Amino acid sequence: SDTVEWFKQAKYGMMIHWGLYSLLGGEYQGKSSSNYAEWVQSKLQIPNKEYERLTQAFNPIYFDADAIIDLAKRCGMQYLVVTTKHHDGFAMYRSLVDPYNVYDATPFHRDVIGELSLACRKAGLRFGLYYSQDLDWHEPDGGGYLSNDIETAGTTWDNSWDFTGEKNYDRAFKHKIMPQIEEIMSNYGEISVAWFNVPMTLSDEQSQTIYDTVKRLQPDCLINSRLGNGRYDYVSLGDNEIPEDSDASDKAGNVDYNSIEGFKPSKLGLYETAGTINDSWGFAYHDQNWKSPQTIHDYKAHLNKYGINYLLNVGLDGLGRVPMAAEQALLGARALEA
Amino acid sequence: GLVPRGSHMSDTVEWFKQAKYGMMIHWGLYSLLGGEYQGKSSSNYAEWVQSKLQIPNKEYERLTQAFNPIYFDADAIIDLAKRCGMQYLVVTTKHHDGFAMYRSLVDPYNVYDATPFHRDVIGELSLACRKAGLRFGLYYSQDLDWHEPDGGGYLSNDIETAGTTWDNSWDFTGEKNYDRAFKHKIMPQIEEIMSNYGEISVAWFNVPMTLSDEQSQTIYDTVKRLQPDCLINSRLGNGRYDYVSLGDNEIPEDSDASDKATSVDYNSIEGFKPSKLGLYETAGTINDSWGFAYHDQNWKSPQTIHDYKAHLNKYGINYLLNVGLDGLGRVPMAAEQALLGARALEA
Amino acid sequence: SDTVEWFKQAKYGMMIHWGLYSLLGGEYQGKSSSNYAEWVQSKLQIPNKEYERLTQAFNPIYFDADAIIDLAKRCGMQYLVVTTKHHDGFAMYRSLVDPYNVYDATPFHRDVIGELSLACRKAGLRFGLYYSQDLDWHEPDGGGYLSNDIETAGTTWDNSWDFTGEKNYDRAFKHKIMPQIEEIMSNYGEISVAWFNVPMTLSDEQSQTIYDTVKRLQPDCLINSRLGNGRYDYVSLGDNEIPEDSDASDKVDYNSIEGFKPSKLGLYETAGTINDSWGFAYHDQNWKSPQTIHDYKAHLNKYGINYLLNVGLDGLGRVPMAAEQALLGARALEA
Amino acid sequence: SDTVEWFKQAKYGMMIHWGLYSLLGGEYQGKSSSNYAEWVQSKLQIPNKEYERLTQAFNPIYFDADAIIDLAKRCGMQYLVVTTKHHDGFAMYRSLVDPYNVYDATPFHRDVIGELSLACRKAGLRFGLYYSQDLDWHEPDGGGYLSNDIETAGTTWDNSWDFTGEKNYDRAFKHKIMPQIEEIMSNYGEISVAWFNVPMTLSDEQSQTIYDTVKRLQPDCLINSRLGNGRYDYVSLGDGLYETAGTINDSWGFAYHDQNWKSPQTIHDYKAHLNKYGINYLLNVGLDGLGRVPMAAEQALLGARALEA
Amino acid sequence: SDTVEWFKQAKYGMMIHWGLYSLLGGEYQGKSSSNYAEWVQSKLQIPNKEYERLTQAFNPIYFDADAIIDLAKRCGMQYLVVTTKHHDGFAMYRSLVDPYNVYDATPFHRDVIGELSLACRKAGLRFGLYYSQDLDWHEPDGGGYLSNDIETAGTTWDNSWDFTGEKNYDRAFKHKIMPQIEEIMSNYGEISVAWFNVPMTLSDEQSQTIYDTVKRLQPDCLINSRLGNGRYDYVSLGDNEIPEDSDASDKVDYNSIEGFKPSKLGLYETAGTINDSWGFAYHDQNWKSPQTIHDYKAHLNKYGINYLLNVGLDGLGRVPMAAEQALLGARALEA
Amino acid sequence: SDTVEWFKQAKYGMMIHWGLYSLLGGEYQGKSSSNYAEWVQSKLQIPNKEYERLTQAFNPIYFDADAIIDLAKRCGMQYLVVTTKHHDGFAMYRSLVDPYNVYDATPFHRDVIGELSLACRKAGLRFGLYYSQDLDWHEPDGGGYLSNDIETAGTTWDNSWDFTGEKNYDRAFKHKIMPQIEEIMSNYGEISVAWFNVPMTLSDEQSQTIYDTVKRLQPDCLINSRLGNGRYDYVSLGDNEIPEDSDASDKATSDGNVDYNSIEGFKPSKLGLYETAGTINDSWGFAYHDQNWKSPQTIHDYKAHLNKYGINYLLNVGLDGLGRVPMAAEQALLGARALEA
Numbered sequence A: 001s002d003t004v005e006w007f008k009q010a011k012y013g014m015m016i017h018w019g020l021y022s023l024l025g026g027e028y029q030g031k032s033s034s035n036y037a038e039w040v041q042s043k044l045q046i047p048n049k050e051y052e053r054l055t056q057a058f059n060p061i062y063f064d065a066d067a068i069i070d071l072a073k074r075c076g077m078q079y080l081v082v083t084t085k086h087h088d089g090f091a092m093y094r095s096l097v098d099p100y101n102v103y104d105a106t107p108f109h110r111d112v113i114g115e116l117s118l119a120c121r122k123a124g125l126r127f128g129l130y131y132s133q134d135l136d137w138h139e140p141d142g143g144g145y146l147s148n149d150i151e152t153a154g155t156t157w158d159n160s161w162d163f164t165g166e167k168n169y170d171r172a173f174k175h176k177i178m179p180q181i182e183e184i185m186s187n188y189g190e191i192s193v194a195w196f197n198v199p200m201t202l203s204d205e206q207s208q209t210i211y212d213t214v215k216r217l218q219p220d221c222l223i224n225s226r227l228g229n230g231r232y233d234y235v236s237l238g239d240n241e242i243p244e245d246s247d248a249s250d251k252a253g254n255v256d257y258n259s260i261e262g263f264k265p266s267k268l269g270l271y272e273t274a275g276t277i278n279d280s281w282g283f284a285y286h287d288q289n290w291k292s293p294q295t296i297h298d299y300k301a302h303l304n305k306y307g308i309n310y311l312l313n314v315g316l317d318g319l320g321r322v323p324m325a326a327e328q329a330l331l332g333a334r335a336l337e338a
Numbered sequence B: 001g002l003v004p005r006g007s008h009m010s011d012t013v014e015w016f017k018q019a020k021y022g023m024m025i026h027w028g029l030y031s032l033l034g035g036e037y038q039g040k041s042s043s044n045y046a047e048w049v050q051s052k053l054q055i056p057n058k059e060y061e062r063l064t065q066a067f068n069p070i071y072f073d074a075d076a077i078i079d080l081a082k083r084c085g086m087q088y089l090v091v092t093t094k095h096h097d098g099f100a101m102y103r104s105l106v107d108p109y110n111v112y113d114a115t116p117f118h119r120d121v122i123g124e125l126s127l128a129c130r131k132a133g134l135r136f137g138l139y140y141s142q143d144l145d146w147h148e149p150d151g152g153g154y155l156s157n158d159i160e161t162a163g164t165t166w167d168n169s170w171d172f173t174g175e176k177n178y179d180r181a182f183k184h185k186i187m188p189q190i191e192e193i194m195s196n197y198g199e200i201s202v203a204w205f206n207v208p209m210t211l212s213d214e215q216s217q218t219i220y221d222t223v224k225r226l227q228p229d230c231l232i233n234s235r236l237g238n239g240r241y242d243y244v245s246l247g248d249n250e251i252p253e254d255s256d257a258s259d260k261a262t263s264v265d266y267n268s269i270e271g272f273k274p275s276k277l278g279l280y281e282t283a284g285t286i287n288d289s290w291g292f293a294y295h296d297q298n299w300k301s302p303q304t305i306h307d308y309k310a311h312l313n314k315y316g317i318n319y320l321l322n323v324g325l326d327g328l329g330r331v332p333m334a335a336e337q338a339l340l341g342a343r344a345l346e347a
Numbered sequence C, E: 001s002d003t004v005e006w007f008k009q010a011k012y013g014m015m016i017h018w019g020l021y022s023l024l025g026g027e028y029q030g031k032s033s034s035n036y037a038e039w040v041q042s043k044l045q046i047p048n049k050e051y052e053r054l055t056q057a058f059n060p061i062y063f064d065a066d067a068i069i070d071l072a073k074r075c076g077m078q079y080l081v082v083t084t085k086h087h088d089g090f091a092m093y094r095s096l097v098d099p100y101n102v103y104d105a106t107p108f109h110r111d112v113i114g115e116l117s118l119a120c121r122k123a124g125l126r127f128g129l130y131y132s133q134d135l136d137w138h139e140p141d142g143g144g145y146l147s148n149d150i151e152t153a154g155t156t157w158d159n160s161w162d163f164t165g166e167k168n169y170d171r172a173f174k175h176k177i178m179p180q181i182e183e184i185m186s187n188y189g190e191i192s193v194a195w196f197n198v199p200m201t202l203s204d205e206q207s208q209t210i211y212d213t214v215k216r217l218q219p220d221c222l223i224n225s226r227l228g229n230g231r232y233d234y235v236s237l238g239d240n241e242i243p244e245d246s247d248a249s250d251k252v253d254y255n256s257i258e259g260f261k262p263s264k265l266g267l268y269e270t271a272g273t274i275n276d277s278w279g280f281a282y283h284d285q286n287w288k289s290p291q292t293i294h295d296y297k298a299h300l301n302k303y304g305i306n307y308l309l310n311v312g313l314d315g316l317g318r319v320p321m322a323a324e325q326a327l328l329g330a331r332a333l334e335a
Numbered sequence D: 001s002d003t004v005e006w007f008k009q010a011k012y013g014m015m016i017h018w019g020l021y022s023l024l025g026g027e028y029q030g031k032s033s034s035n036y037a038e039w040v041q042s043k044l045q046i047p048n049k050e051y052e053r054l055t056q057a058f059n060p061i062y063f064d065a066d067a068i069i070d071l072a073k074r075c076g077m078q079y080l081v082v083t084t085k086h087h088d089g090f091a092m093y094r095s096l097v098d099p100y101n102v103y104d105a106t107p108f109h110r111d112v113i114g115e116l117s118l119a120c121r122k123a124g125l126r127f128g129l130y131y132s133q134d135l136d137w138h139e140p141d142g143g144g145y146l147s148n149d150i151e152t153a154g155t156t157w158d159n160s161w162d163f164t165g166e167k168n169y170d171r172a173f174k175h176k177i178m179p180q181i182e183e184i185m186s187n188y189g190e191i192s193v194a195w196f197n198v199p200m201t202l203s204d205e206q207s208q209t210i211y212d213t214v215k216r217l218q219p220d221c222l223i224n225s226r227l228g229n230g231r232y233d234y235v236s237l238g239d240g241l242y243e244t245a246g247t248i249n250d251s252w253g254f255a256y257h258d259q260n261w262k263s264p265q266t267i268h269d270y271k272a273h274l275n276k277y278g279i280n281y282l283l284n285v286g287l288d289g290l291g292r293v294p295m296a297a298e299q300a301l302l303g304a305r306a307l308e309a
Numbered sequence F: 001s002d003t004v005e006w007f008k009q010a011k012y013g014m015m016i017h018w019g020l021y022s023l024l025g026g027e028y029q030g031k032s033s034s035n036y037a038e039w040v041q042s043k044l045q046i047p048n049k050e051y052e053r054l055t056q057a058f059n060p061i062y063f064d065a066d067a068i069i070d071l072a073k074r075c076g077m078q079y080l081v082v083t084t085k086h087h088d089g090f091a092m093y094r095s096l097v098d099p100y101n102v103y104d105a106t107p108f109h110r111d112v113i114g115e116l117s118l119a120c121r122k123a124g125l126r127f128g129l130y131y132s133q134d135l136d137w138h139e140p141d142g143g144g145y146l147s148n149d150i151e152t153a154g155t156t157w158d159n160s161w162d163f164t165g166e167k168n169y170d171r172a173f174k175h176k177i178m179p180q181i182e183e184i185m186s187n188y189g190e191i192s193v194a195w196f197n198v199p200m201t202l203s204d205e206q207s208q209t210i211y212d213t214v215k216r217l218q219p220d221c222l223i224n225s226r227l228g229n230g231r232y233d234y235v236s237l238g239d240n241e242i243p244e245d246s247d248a249s250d251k252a253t254s255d256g257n258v259d260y261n262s263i264e265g266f267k268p269s270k271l272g273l274y275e276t277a278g279t280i281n282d283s284w285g286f287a288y289h290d291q292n293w294k295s296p297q298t299i300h301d302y303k304a305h306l307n308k309y310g311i312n313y314l315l316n317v318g319l320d321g322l323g324r325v326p327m328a329a330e331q332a333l334l335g336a337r338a339l340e341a
């Protein structure tokens, strides 16, 4: 495969997390998110009716897809993966299936995914899509409701505060998850990476259905291991997981295909660690724990030396900007390369 | 204590002498930028960003369309002040960028007319203060106005600032005459704010870089005409004041605080000046900025706030402690917690 | 079927009529509707161009799905059936097929059906959907143009004033009716009741096509007899029809809307109004008393007939005070 | 005075009550107004924060000033008196003094008083203005706070729920009442009638200041006996120049549940009785939330006209 | 076919070009083109990001579909063919597939094609649709990038200023072109004429796919020769092509847009403009006289060729006065 | 006066006509304006209720004050005079007195006069304001109702179709005219020229009141003769009036009394100041169907002829509905500039 040989040498990509959570920036009504500001709805059990009010404050006058792609290109990043829909269920593209999206529901009235697709194509960057296929806090049958024995970066995995009755993920899978995956894999050109997440609920068959649908629409798209249940083309390591040299040299009993930490089998020999510059995925006002240029440089070098890609995230602010400290960290790391 | 119903029975002078502690609010379009613009930093003063980065008015004005602070709640801000034992609240009606935070008939560059928010922030804070029994004060940039070709500061650019120049020297590069801005915008807006928001206890002017003694006097007399009990700070300039504002964050050492010595540049903003009435105030910040600044997390501790307040008050100096609201109209969590923490150290 | 045994014992449901007609409230340009305010467009032959202007006045700041469902629940009602689209053709949900709907066309910019679905699910009420499958005054090929020998609550059954040429219901059936039924039966979760109406035009095959489509998307949904042509799971009696003992003890024009019809499953329902209109009507204060509501309910239920009692929400999205008081009063008469 | 001789023979006028209260139509949160729907904010102590939400629902697509005036004219009404601002304090004209008004605060974004002024002038009806000078539930210092020993069509005369501190009408008088009276008596052409309330709170001096201001701006405007200043042009009789104001049903504001409309014959007979004694009949219409004359009101008026020949 | 015999005797139709280009009227930011105003994005290489801003200025308060159709009818025109989407890629109908359209993207918030469809039906005019199936300057994979039959020479017509990389029309064909053709052939009633254009990229198979899809959805729709590759029911001559007697009496590059081509059914049409532009152009006052229009029509018709005469509406939705007067004047020259 | 010596040598200025009429562009319901497209409301007796609909179509995304001033400057024009309010009564600035204005009533929501003032100041062009003090078709008491024996570029001078009863200009003078003049002479910096028009109704006292008000607010502002009644600082000739050599030499059209409220010919000028305002085509407002653009040579020669007699040439641009200078207008202006050394 051309995509396979490409991904093996791609080395470095930019990830983007952006959504309504970015406006809150890790604070709400005088209380804090966890280190993951994008989990704030769960952490503080924000009712959908309240969280939806953020739509009216979403008018990011500084968002400029071409400028973001240009920054990625100047840093030597070869692909960009963006949140089409995170756990809160809010789509960052024009979804016919669900009007809870950036185009229909906000004054911004623009398809963010559309703009980033176009910018990537112009600049010659490959384009990837993140989608929360399991969790959806906007849906009564969103995933996570069987997993609450496992601690989260919020409270529960699912929206357990608005929705307290019988739940069946199958219904959300059929009505929202699969239709939206069809939208994003149809409407934005060639997709090189599909980034799924936290497969807490979906069955082997549901993972397979997604896998097959993605490949039908996007034959060369690489799917990451967090689609769950062994249905994937490359392995995502844990959040910010920089494996020890020894373990990265082995890339290594039973594997839990739905765990998100550590190595898993990879027939194609493809691996990626997604990481953050500070400690959040979403923008977080009070997290100034930005990794230094030296740290970023060394993480990238270590991953790449062992055949692992580094997908480094930017959490855009409420105005659509790369935080200055994020940009300076990225450019600083780039300056340390020959 | 002989006043009309609805007024404070304590005379403003005796009140201010014992007031000890007030809240200041800085809020405007600069709060959206939060100390950054196009990948570049403000100075420590995020509200100075327009000058620091010479942002053209045509660009800066675009911020109006992003100003929809759905979490602004005047009653909640007043409640925080009151529970912390603050006895007054002083709010930016218009800062150096020239953008009004009230419904100005004189100038549509304001929060009511120019933003989707379409609400009179000063009006809401006035009403909240009245309901809670807090005295209400108004900050107004009478000299600098970066939205006005004749805004002040154009004679002062030999002196370093928290931006670049004192004036807007990038959009406006020709002949300038502050007198025109004084007549057309400054005096009319002062008349608005001193007329339309009830009883005003404090008038907080700033950086008197340009206005003449006569212009200072004209302001002083107009404020007193509209608001006979309003106390005016020393940064109106030229000796026209009722109380002395110390420097920004100026906590004088015991010896200086005791002596308050002057035997004076009336247009300087540092150090003591004469006060016939014996009234003094230090305005300070919880972090290092007046406006909200995303990258300034240097929040003073509860203990520091408590100690600063106690030190100032022991020497008869009031502490006016600022909150820079964010773009959504919120008190930053660390600021709220610092204030509540300081309150917990009293009893 | 679980839905069958449920419906047999459900006894009592709330119906909702709400639309652009609710703003007019039974008056337009100084003239009155009939007793049916929701028929005003036909009664007064309001041109579509004029009627559509109502969209801009539709901003019901007091609409609260949770509060409506809570009132139903407090009254012992076990299900709620709501107008997704009445005869005027205006959809009260986000229809991709047709932008003449509450989400796309009004400042309210909210999916009313979506909000009611969510509220019903949270409170454990079963949810039903009303759809005018035959009449559509917004469509040149809307039904009713073969039926004008039969008296109406307006003028004609069809829009005969904007559309005066050749008509063919098959075109509207294909392009609007079936696609919208697919939307409402796909996008709002489990649907327990489908309430069709006034089958003045559609063929046996068209009734069957709807029936099959509803069952495909909603296997447990019970369909009422006004789908027409014998394609149904339960019998709807006439509007406000409280049957006399002889007929009710015993329980055929399949497209008539009055009287009994065969019911293989033994399921029956009378839909009624608290006043005399389905839609909100400013000048109709003829509210049935608590005792009348109580007695109608008891009478219907003793024959195994469900009582589906309608509320016509006002232009602000409110239950009229007199309607709320009637319902709560009736509930107070149960021991 | 030309206005004096005119008013003596005018016989019949239309009054209009219209405001945010008209949207509620005598109900709020499942509770009733009294017979006076326009008093609902007081009756049910609706907080200003909640009541103000009505602004967003105010888009009366059927409001047509020319059509209202044409109805008045066809019935032989010679003047129209309209609510510029009722007790709730919401102005139905573009007020520079206060943005709580129909132009600035609603999607309708139109000056209702302006449109009615123009319509009256085109049709040759004299134009009159009603203004609540004492009560103002939108103002902390609105009047009524000395009068709560007297029962009302609501609860208290003042807003006693949002505003619970010291009250001094002098402040509202200076900042809102006098400035708004100056607006309405300046910006809408010749005003023939000024309709104020019976003063619960104003001083003699304040009533006099209003009288003098009106006459200064509108030298031919008639002031009636309600104003309380002790100088007036005509006597406002119960709710040689005289006028009785009345309603067609029992509410001033539109009230969905009041269908107690007076018959054509009643209106005809009442008007004839008043006119035989040299009393003008000022008959109110309460427009609905869409800006319409209720059908039964229109039918009553035209019916009464048909009984004259 | 009924449409075949109808088209043979129809003789005279109205064409409408209307879009964002109509606002610019051949001028843009200190530049101008006297070529076809609807081509201004290409002729002045206006970036999509700039051109899109025109959406916010599009509020044609004078647009009145009934009035346009009534003008056509009074002139004896028997059909109306309107731009659903021209080369700039902006749809003049509510497209689910692409929000770059007059309903979703402009304050006008109205379906222009929908309104014209309804107006035509009421007046008894047949309705036709123009769609740019090949060029689409809003799409990176829009057609035009393969120089048609002449090597290089500047003879590409894609958007080559915004989109400079490798291109594959098949992607746009699948994702935008075919879905939109399905929309317009599904959602606007009976379509009598399909007017395609400049087939310089699509394959014979792609032409066939369009042809078959149009016929599936609209069995009576006649397709013009500019669909390309021989897939058509009638021959479109060149723009404004008034053939000489010799050529007209006699009547092959299937993808050329000039001259005669074989016509099994004997159906032919020349589309022409009243001035020299299809879209409205501020500076083009070169209006043909009544006499010229009359004589062109007679010349075309005497050879069995229909005359499809275009109106370019202005930015307010109006027929330019000189255009209306030319058309009515030509009508006055008929008995 | 500095302004007097300045105006005498200024020679050449730009005028701007822009308003709701620019959207119609001289056509309405299939009917034509006269040569003056800005008079279309009167020509076709458009009811105010209908004309007001134009506000919702006014969103001129290509308006750029700096670019308009830059064109003026490139052509050697030394001042710019813009319509704050023409006969239709629609204000092109934020008027507190009247919400029928470009800021309050249109999606554009921008103060056109404010933007032009700022652009003029940055570029060092003097700034002038046009205001229709007499006619106002939006006001029942607008002027013109005594003058309908005299033909116009529409029908009547006044709005005689919406307003058919008794009229008294005094009311409009007090409530709209004087307050708006106060606004525009207060809120837009130093004003060098005040351009009034068609003084069909106002009295000598009313002309004087305006004159005094303008001078109070703008001491150095030069007021043109169309204020009426002899109350002026310089003489405006007729529309597009290029006087014959003999008359231009004498600065006189006849030997006796002048009519101070006529708009044609010379009048006395104590300060020796004169100006002809003219058009590039035949309309003041933008006109879709008027392509009768004067040639570069004509513009050059008109300017030279006027200037040789100490008469200024104030040449108008009628912006289109998008806020643009028509290309043919720009090309005529730059063409004329090219013919100067």
Ligand SMILES: [Mg+2]
Pocket: D196, D197, D198, D226
């Ligand atoms: Mg009274």
